């Protein structure tokens, strides 16, 4: 399906460059909890909501990349001459992010030292999300509409990216300051967002089609919600609340 070798290699390069930028951020907090043997400063509510965001994106990537049954439903849907919009680096990212989120969740349990349980309202959201996904599973099952089910997981991942960014931007607006700002972590999130979009743009200009942006709408919105909020964070840090 890849027509151009330079475009394919630049797609593969931009792919692992997006993977590295978003996967390396998981380590500084992981190591900090380890050195301390405590999770006092951690928002437990956010770690449980990011597990749902990561596992839903992981469901979609692992299934579309490895299942030929689901892939055939993608061609039946977006077109026979369509390239699958899941990359090796997207699969690697989703699995690595699920592993790292499970490790920090394990650190919260074994290291404890976090009386601030936080756990409430956000627990109801996990119940509502996984409940709505369970109903969706039983709807999809008789017809084996695994592409529609995988597609719900990718849409709930989108909602969950908003859940990552919106409370932290809202906090900065009420607070009238950017507390916890790090030009480095924002630039790593930014690179991963631009590179995840440049990957789709390369797949789209290699083939003469934009259907990959519609097939993997969840990855398209994952990059655009990251880029929008990084511009907004940089905007409220330098021109709004600087000092």
């Amino acid at each position: 399906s890849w027509n151009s070798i330079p475009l394919e290699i630049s797609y593969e390069i931009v792919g692992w460059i997006a993977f590295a930028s978003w996967s390396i951020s998981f380590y500084p907090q992981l190591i900090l909890n380890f050195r301390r043997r405590s999770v006092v400063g951690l928002n437990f509510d956010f770690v449980m909501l990011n597990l749902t965001k990561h596992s839903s994106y992981m469901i979609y990537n692992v299934c579309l990349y490895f299942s030929p049954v689901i892939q055939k439903q993608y061609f039946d849907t977006y077109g026979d001459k369509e390239m699958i919009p899941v990359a090796a680096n997207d699969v690697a990212f989703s699995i690595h992010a699920v592993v790292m989120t499970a490790v920090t969740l394990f650190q919260i349990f074994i290291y404890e030292r976090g009386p601030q349980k936080v756990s409430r309202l956000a627990i109801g959201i996990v119940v509502v999300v996984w409940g709505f996904a369970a109903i969706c599973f039983f709807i999809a099952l008789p017809t084996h509409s695994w592409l529609w089910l995988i597609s719900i997981f990718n849409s709930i991942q989108v909602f969950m990216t908003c859940v990552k960014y919106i409370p932290q931007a809202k906090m900065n607006f009420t607070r009238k300051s950017t507390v916890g700002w790090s030009i480095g972590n924002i630039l790593l999130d930014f690179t991963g967002g631009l590179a995840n979009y440049l990957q789709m743009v390369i797949q789209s200009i290699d083939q003469n089609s934009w259907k990959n942006f519609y097939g993997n709408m969840g990855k398209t919105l994952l990059s655009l919600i990251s880029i929008f909020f990084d511009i907004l964070f940089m905007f409220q840090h330098y021109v709004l609340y600087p000092e």
């Epitope: 400063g41 607070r175 916890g180």
Partner: nanobody, 121 residues
Framework: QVQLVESGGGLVQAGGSLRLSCAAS????????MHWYRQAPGKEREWVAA????????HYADSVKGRFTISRDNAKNTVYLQMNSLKPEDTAVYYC??????????????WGQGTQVTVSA
């Protein structure tokens, strides 16, 4: 910006008591969840106690549960660490702590200079 000033600590003999204090500046203590931490020489910082944002709910490290007590005087903007039944184990620079809890991305920890509490057998 925000300043923390600990005082009350010094040398005491095993079995004694101390009333550590913390003078908050830049923020109300009744609005924030206040913490106490300790650091023994060479060993890493250890969270010791906490008092809820708008209430009297408290939490302590298992090493001090039953001996230490955290309270706050609203009419003084200060947090206290009434530490009874002291042991030479408890020797450390005690820091009162407040933070700017941050949903995703790094929480900002505010510290005082600390007060050395030395307990001798």
């Amino acid at each position: 910006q925000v300043q923390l000033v600990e005082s009350g600590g010094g040398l005491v003999q095993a079995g004694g008591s101390l009333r550590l204090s913390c003078a908050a500046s830049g923020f109300p203590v009744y609005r924030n969840r206040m913490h106490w931490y300790r650091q023994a020489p060479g060993k890493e910082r250890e969270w010791v106690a906490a008092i809820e944002s708008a209430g009297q709910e408290t939490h302590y490290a298992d090493s001090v549960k039953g001996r230490f007590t955290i309270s706050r005087d609203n009419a003084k903007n200060t947090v206290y660490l009434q530490m009874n039944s002291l042991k030479p184990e408890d020797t450390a620079v005690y820091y009162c702590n407040v933070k700017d809890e941050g949903w995703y991305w790094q929480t900002y920890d505010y510290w005082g200079q600390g007060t050395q509490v030395t307990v001798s057998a």
